Design a protein around this ligand. Structure first.
Ligand code: HEM
Length: 399
């Protein structure tokens, strides 16, 4: 059994292993860092099965759970939030914060999302680049999702820049173990204060709603509110930043489609759909342990055995998406759901918000900067470690 996670073939490419597995061994065993084994699912149909099977669990205290790293095993000890819960606990807590993320709520949030993007682009414009290139990530990809989630949670405007920087340190590759944890602990400390404040004087934000609707009635306690808010912050920020960066690099990679997007920003929604399929920036979250024996394909996964379902591989499944390795914003979509945001009960709570942010970004970015260009040969782009989720660390641009 090969060691997993696999390493991406190249900077922007998915691991080479998946294609081969989908064709010759769709359901196989891989070896994890601690030597334990797990079943790796690579076909779209099987990934969907794993994501929805009631015979599988997300509880990490169950023996056999596929932890992919030393730290993962440690994190599994703390009290769990809905991300690691099975029904009915899962929705009992998730429904506590779902209102802000419904399709309707997000549609009503559009103007706010637009102004957040406009202001960041304007500040990046006046800041100019007359003395050289600027980092699109630091100046744009990072603050867009950061300010929005922080604002929705209840963070005041003046604290956004500092908190955005601290949250970045949390996952930054250059950060030392000490720097990462301190930034992490600091964010938790800040959230604790916000909860205390909103418990006293509630405002129109997520933290205040948890405080009034769950904490006060005694449904959850303060630390719970802090952890739930923390999850909403760290769960998808790094991914959002990587998706925006990856989007810009991809458009530079395919000039003709960038030409098309500029000419018709109305194509943004479909460009975002193809981007979330082509670049599956979160491919290691659909994990489970079998509660009882379950047959998947030609294999029998026995009780207490772990399973990793690659939504990244599923998104390149040639049986579902024709010419899967071709990025095409004008792609003819099949009836099957691309899985950039997972599937089933646990499907990304912020899928609609994430798409709205991305759609706003790519329907506006080139309108503001028609001549935006990556200020460095594409083959030299600084991507994330090949053994981690796909993404871009920094992206020098000129406009
Ligand atoms: C383009 C950006 C994003 C992508 C591609 C993405 C993708 C995903 C994926 C693959 C999952 C796993 C779903 C499953 O278990 O089947 C997930 C879960 C989750 N995401 Fe995101 N996400 C994004 C943005 C966000 C944002 C902005 C937030 C926060 C507001 C967020 C919050 C969460 C949470 C809390 C979960 C756990 C849901 C649950 O287990 O019930 N995501 N996301």
């Amino acid at each position: 059994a090969p060691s997993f996670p696999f390493s991406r073939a190249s900077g922007p490419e998915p691991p080479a292993e998946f294609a081969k597995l989908r064709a010759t061994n769709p359901v196989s065993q891989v070896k994890l860092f601690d030597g334990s084994l797990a079943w790796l699912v690579t076909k779209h149909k099987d990934v969907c099965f794993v994501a929805t099977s009631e015979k599988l669990s997300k509880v990490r205290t169950r023996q056999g759970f596929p932890e992919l790293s030393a730290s993962g095993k440690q994190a599994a000890k703390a009290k769990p939030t809905f991300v690691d819960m099975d029904p009915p606990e899962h929705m009992h807590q998730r429904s506590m914060v779902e209102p802000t993320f419904t399709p309707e709520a997000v549609k009503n949030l559009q103007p706010y999302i637009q102004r957040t993007v406009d202001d960041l682009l304007e500040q990046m414009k006046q800041k100019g680049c007359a003395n050289g290139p600027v980092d699109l990530v630091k100046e744009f990809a990072l603050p867009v999702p950061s300010y929005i989630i922080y604002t929705l949670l209840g963070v005041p405007f003046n604290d956004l820049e500092y908190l955005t920087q601290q949250n970045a340190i949390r996952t930054n590759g250059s950060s030392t173990a000490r720097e990462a944890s301190a930034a992490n602990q600091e964010l938790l400390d800040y959230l604790a204060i916000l909860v205390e404040q909103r418990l006293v004087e509630p405002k129109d934000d997520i933290i205040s709603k948890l405080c009034t609707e769950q904490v006060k009635p005694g449904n959850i306690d303060k630390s719970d509110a802090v952890q739930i808010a923390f999850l909403l912050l760290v769960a998808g920020n790094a991914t959002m930043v990587n998706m925006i960066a990856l989007g810009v690099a991809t458009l530079a990679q395919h000039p003709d489609q960038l030409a098309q997007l500029k000419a018709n920003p109305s194509l943004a929604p479909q460009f975002v759909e193809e981007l979330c399929r082509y670049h599956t920036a979160s491919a290691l979250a659909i994990k489970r342990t079998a509660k009882e024996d379950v047959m998947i394909g030609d294999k029998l996964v026995r009780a207490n055995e772990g399973i990793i379902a690659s939504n990244q591989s599923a998104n390149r499944d040639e049986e579902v998406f024709e010419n899967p390795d071709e990025f095409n914003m004008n792609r003819k979509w099949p009836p099957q759901d691309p899985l950039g945001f997972g599937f089933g009960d646990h499907r990304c709570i912020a899928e609609h918000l994430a798409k709205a942010e991305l759609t706003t970004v790519f329907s506006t970015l080139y309108q503001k900067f028609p001549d935006l260009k990556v200020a460095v040969p594409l083959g030299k782009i600084n991507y994330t470690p090949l053994n981690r989720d796909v993404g871009i660390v920094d992206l020098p641009v000129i406009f």
